[PDB]
């Protein structure tokens, strides 16, 4: 019985987004913190800035907040890219 609190977001960025401007990574990380804080308390926020799929993980204090973040974010648009949001499988390291 896993009560998963971690949300995996993909297609949020591409690593080439960061190569010209060294401030963009923190800009978009903080943008994600702001949006995700609408769903509940965040425990841990990670952007995998070398991953070609544009992966971030957002870990919430309670599984209900993760469920609500997944419902609201999957299919939304971020900087002109349509993102996916889904429960972490509990094993994959991005």
């Amino acid at each position: 019985m896993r009560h998963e609190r971690v949300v995996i977001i993909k297609n949020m960025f591409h690593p080439m987004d960061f190569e010209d401007d060294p401030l963009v990574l923190n800009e978009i990380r903080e943008d994600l913190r702001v949006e995700c804080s609408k769903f509940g308390q965040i425990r841990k926020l990670l952007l995998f800035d070398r991953h070609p799929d544009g992966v971030a993980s957002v870990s919430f204090r309670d599984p209900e907040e993760a469920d609500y973040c997944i419902q609201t974010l999957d299919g939304r648009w971020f900087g002109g890219r349509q993102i996916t949001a889904q429960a972490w499988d509990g094993t994959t390291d991005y």
Partner: peptide
């Protein structure tokens, strides 16, 4: 912000 880049949202939506």
């Amino acid at each position: 912000s880049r949202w939506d």
